[PDB]
């Protein structure tokens, strides 16, 4: 209250995470499971393979027969249970998917075989020399070999990608319990903002943050609501916020919250909404005037982020604070971002504060670390790349011995997009 | 023709890329630009900032007045062109977004100022001590400082993410020319396959590849078509393929194309479709029986991939060959995958062939290289992770001196998902 609390980066991060709830669950079709977190253990209802299956192209054979000269009684078809029993001195053609027939207990690949006789040839083999003494069970995948019936194939907490979805198809579990995704409402405040579709007017600029922020969170596959530009006054701020609270889990705003300004939005969170503002300023560059609040409303907790209006500050703070909170909301067990080591492409002058620059990570032939070419000082000095920024260069706060960093020095980088 | 051509991994990759066309263009709303490639240069139609803007909270001042005692004639409002001219001995309140008024040419931050007088106080300042001699132009962002009118802000070939979308909003370019995304049709062939929704029947298994493959390509944000399970016969293969050709750019099938089998599908591509099969087998593990064909139909080129039916082979080959082809199709200038250096978590026995294992990349505190824990030998030996595989461990072909690799040795890894 009054000039709000100044916090450290680390303390702010922990606060966002600790104050953010994990959302409840719902049942979805497995095809909609990308990026979802299982809220249940998934068990197999069948043994895979469900029948003993050949591991190779070759012949289902009796081991006891040994390397003799044999009669080919037929072929085991994929998708068809075999009807014939392999008797002494007989053999059945088999392909690598194929069910082992009732009389054989070994498979001899075709390479340890030679055609002796063919029914003239209208595409048919009648006799083969089996050149090998096979071991009982050889080249056969027994029932339950891959997955046993009742066994847990996916555990609670698994964050699912393509292969997990395919594992669910395999076991025939097509509906599945998972954590909900957060719905995120985005708005921009400022009397100087116009919609990107509008032409400029005196004293006005186009609003870019709303579209950048909506785009950033859509990339993680979370549903969004566009609440538009809200005038910078208590009446319109309150109404905008009330609509986001009723329609969303998270509200993000950006615009005029610095040392001067912070006023109307903090004033409505505090007085009208009775939200609990956890911090209003964070010791960092850029994004010092970042606010984090929570509203406990009807047993439910909504989270609110007031990001700065500066376009680079808004995108940085979204990636440092918002995305991690959303990752926890949708059930991810470790919602922290991946941070990797890279080399600076340039020299940089450290600031007293921890600083974050949008950058591009590039891996060059046979080098251990990628190079981080900083671009996130954008606007008046932009040397355009064909690539998007895929990381945040995390510059350390200046020390007494470390005033600047040199090209080639190993530094930390938050991965913020697909490499 | 007859047993088709055996190719190397590298040769196969180049062939896929070289034979794959770049798709044409279309105009989209900028909000739909995620992952798109600009097909035009984008130029600014306004100077940003469009007015000279304050860089700080403080006062618009006359430099020539120096550090005197001044009368505050008002405040410059964001979104409003100022009406008053700052005269000698006067000053206007200003916030960091705010337009510089017509008489000032310097901004003195509030920290180099002291309140002298306030109109009693109903929230109002009347006089300030300016404690500093400002330089003309100080703390002011001139017109065009960030972007100049007519200047190129985004070039042809730019692969767009959130910040680019926001840059388009900034310049008011809301419709934009970009390369189309490929539409990809997926089908599974095999007489032994059932839909994941079905319960098992004798000799049958559930089809998992279709859902894994559809999921993998949806993750890159490309539109898909599910063509379902097609029986393994020429009539039904032809009809399935004809439908994918009429509705899609790319057709992917998986199922029974090994040394035994390859038959019906290659036979229909060759004889009925007259597609040009570029390769039918590739010297690799897994996925040896991978086929790549192209169809030139009515001036248009369709591409066809016949992936193996083995579930791990299908997902590996999709990431090595399909995704890169789709990346080129949607206009990406360098469609090759990112390959990084990592350490093996285990010992591995090299194979004569180049081998690929799905793995999980993990960065540990303060270490240069991530560790690659191989999991992609899946099915009968799976020690479950909460994380999805996010890379392909690229094991070198066995040599005379290098028979096996040890835990901790630096190896290559294709990044296949978000870190």
């Amino acid at each position: 209250m009054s000039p709000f609390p100044l916090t450290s980066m680390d303390k702010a991060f922990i606060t966002v995470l600790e104050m953010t709830p994990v959302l409840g669950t719902e049942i979805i079709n497995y095809r909609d499971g990308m990026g979802r977190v299982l809220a249940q253990d998934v068990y197999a209802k069948d043994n895979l393979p469900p029948f003993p299956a050949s591991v190779k192209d070759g012949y289902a054979v009796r081991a006891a027969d040994g390397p003799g000269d044999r009669f080919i009684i037929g072929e085991s078809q994929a998708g068809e249970q075999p009807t014939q029993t392999v008797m002494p001195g007989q053999v059945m053609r088999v392909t690598t998917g194929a069910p082992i027939p009732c009389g054989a207990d070994a498979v001899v690949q075709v390479e340890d075989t030679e055609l002796i006789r063919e029914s003239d040839d209208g595409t048919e083999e009648l006799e083969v020399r089996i050149l090998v003494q096979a071991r009982p069970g050889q080249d056969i995948r027994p029932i339950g070999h891959d997955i046993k019936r009742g066994e847990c194939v996916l555990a609670k907490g698994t964050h699912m990608g393509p292969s997990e979805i395919g594992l669910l198809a395999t076991v025939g579990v097509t509906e599945v319990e998972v954590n909900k995704f957060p719905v995120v409402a985005v708005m921009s405040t400022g009397n100087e903002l116009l919609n990107p579709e509008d032409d400029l007017l005196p004293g006005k600029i186009r609003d870019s943050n709303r579209s950048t922020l909506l785009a950033t969170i859509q990339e993680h596959g979370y549903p969004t609501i566009n609440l538009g530009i809200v005038g910078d006054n208590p009446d319109d701020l309150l109404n905008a916020l009330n609509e986001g609270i009723s329609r969303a889990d998270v509200i993000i705003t950006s615009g005029g919250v610095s040392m001067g300004e912070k006023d109307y939005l903090k004033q409505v969170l505090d007085i009208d909404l009775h939200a609990q503002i956890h911090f209003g300023r964070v010791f960092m560059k850029p994004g010092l005037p970042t606010t984090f609040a929570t509203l406990d409303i009807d047993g439910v907790r909504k989270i609110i982020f007031a990001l700065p209006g500066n376009p680079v500050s808004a995108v940085v703070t979204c990636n440092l604070f918002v995305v991690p909170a959303l990752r926890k909301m949708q059930g991810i067990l470790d919602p922290r971002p991946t941070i990797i080591k890279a080399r600076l492409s340039c020299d940089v002058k450290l600031d007293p504060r921890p600083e974050y620059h949008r950058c591009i990570l590039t891996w060059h032939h046979q080098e251990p670390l990628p190079w981080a070419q900083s671009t996130g000082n954008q606007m008046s000095s932009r040397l355009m790349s064909m690539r998007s920024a895929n990381g945040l260069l995390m510059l350390p706060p200046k020390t007494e011995q470390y005033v600047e960093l040199h090209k080639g020095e190993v530094v930390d980088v938050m991965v913020i997009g697909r490499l | 023709m007859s047993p088709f051509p055996l190719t190397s991994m590298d040769k196969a990759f180049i062939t896929v890329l070289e034979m794959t066309p770049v798709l044409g263009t279309e105009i989209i709303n900028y909000r739909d630009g995620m992952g798109r490639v600009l097909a035009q240069d984008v130029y600014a139609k306004d100077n940003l900032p469009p007015f000279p803007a304050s860089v700080k909270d403080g006062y618009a001042v006359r430099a020539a007045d120096g550090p005197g005692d001044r009368f505050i004639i008002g405040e410059s409002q964001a979104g409003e062109q100022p009406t008053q001219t700052v005269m000698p001995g006067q000053v206007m309140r200003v916030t960091t977004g705010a337009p510089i008024p017509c008489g000032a040419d310097a901004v003195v931050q509030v920290e180099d100022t002291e309140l002298i007088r306030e109109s009693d106080d109903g929230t109002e300042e009347l006089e300030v001590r300016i404690l500093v001699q400002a330089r003309p132009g100080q703390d002011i962002r001139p017109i065009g400082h960030d972007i100049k009118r007519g200047e190129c802000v985004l070039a042809k070939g730019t692969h767009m993410g959130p910040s680019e979308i926001g840059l388009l909003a900034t310049v008011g370019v809301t419709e934009v020319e970009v390369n189309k995304f490929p539409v990809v049709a997926v089908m599974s062939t095999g007489n032994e396959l059932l839909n994941p929704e079905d319960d098992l029947l004798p000799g049958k298994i559930r089809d998992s590849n279709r859902s894994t493959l559809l999921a993998t390509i949806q993750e890159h944000g490309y539109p898909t078509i599910n063509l379902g399970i097609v029986g393994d016969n020429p009539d039904d293969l032809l009809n399935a393929l004809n439908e994918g050709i009429s509705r899609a750019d790319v057709i992917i099938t998986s199922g029974g194309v090994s040394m035994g089998e390859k038959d019906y599908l290659k036979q229909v591509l060759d004889i009925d479709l007259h597609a040009q099969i570029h390769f039918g087998r590739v010297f690799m593990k897994p996925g040896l029986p991978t086929t790549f064909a192209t169809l030139d139909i009515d001036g248009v080129r369709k591409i066809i991939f016949a992936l193996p039916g083995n579930p791990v082979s299908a997902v590996v080959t999709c990431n090595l060959f399909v995704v890169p082809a789709l990346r080129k199709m949607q206009g990406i200038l360098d469609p090759r995958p990112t390959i990084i250096k990592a350490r093996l978590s285990c010992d591995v026995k090299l194979d004569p062939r180049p081998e690929y294992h799905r793995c999980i990349l993990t960065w540990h505190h303060q270490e240069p290289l991530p560790w690659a824990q191989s999991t992609g030998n899946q099915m009968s030996s799976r020690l479950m992770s909460m994380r999805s595989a996010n890379g392909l461990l690229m094991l070198p072909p066995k040599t005379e001196q290098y028979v096996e690799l040890h835990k901790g040795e630096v190896v290559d890894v294709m990044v296949i998902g978000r870190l």
Binding site: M9, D10, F13, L320, R336, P337, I339, K341, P354, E355, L393, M394, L395, P396, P397, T399, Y402, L405, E409, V410, V411, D412, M414 | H365, Q366, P368
Partner: peptide, 13 residues
């Protein structure tokens, strides 16, 4: 774990 960057010196081990 820290979301604040480390110095190249902290990379000594």
């Amino acid at each position: 774990f820290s979301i604040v960057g480390s110095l190249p010196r902290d990379f000594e081990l």
